[PDB]
Design a protein around this ligand. Sequence first.
Ligand code: HEC
Ligand code: HEC
Ligand code: NI
Ligand code: NI
Lengths: 106, 106
Amino acid sequence: ADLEDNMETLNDNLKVIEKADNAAQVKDALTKMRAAALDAQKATPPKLEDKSPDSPEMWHFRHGFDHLVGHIDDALKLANEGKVKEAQAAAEQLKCHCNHCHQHYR
Amino acid sequence: ADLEDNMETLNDNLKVIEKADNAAQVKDALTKMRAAALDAQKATPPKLEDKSPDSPEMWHFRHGFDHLVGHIDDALKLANEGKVKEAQAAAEQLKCHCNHCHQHYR
Ligand code: HEC
Ligand code: HEC
Ligand code: NI
Ligand code: NI
């Protein structure tokens, strides 16, 4: 999927998690976010096509997705323990990853 | 100074930036936070007291300070350009760095 569709998936499912109140709902939404983040994890974005793959800017951009995926994974483990509210709080903290990357590279 | 000292310094001065009576207080606070972050990077957090310097948890702990310092430096450049409102806006987003590392290790 393209970058815009992946970002919409991340956007909407964050709210699905906030609206949820059980572990299955939160796990399902986090799983969709994980797939969306991985889909976008490798491609050079438009403001960065004039940069090497190992350039500091590309490195930080790719790190942004790797780290987002890591914390999605951590929230999933919470949901898989039935820790609904802790998983929701972890999901809310994902917004930091969103805004950090956007401020750098959007 | 120890890790508790550094964290008090980070907490007090982040609040100074939020409440600064004048623009000059923002730069002075950022300067103190930068020093505190680099000092904290050389500590071992209680929850990782077991781990050797080479452990994956200690790597991510140290890295969070490098990344915090990078964004402090971004905010300092803004302040040194006279863009003091932009610098205060950037400093507010430093809270995400606090929250992220704490989620792992506080
Ligand atoms: C970089 C490592 C990013 C992370 C982490 C997140 N996003 Fe993102 N986002 C990124 C880019 C480069 C862009 C712009 C792409 C372009 O070509 O313009 C975006 C855009 C969005 C959007 C706007 C969608 C649109 O139709 O234009 C949204 C709504 C969005 N991103 C949401 C979002 C969320 C919720 C994230 C965290 C959970 C998130 N993004 C992370 C780069 C990066
Ligand atoms: C890791 C990379 C961290 C970053 C970035 C920040 N903090 Fe932190 N903080 C961290 C740890 C491992 C701990 C526990 C230390 C301990 O001895 O238990 C803390 C703790 C704090 C505290 C409580 C301190 C105390 O005396 O118990 C505060 C008030 C605090 N941290 C504030 C703080 C702020 C405001 C930060 C961003 C500017 C910040 N920390 C970043 C690890 C990390
Ligand atoms: Ni992390
Ligand atoms: Ni950054």
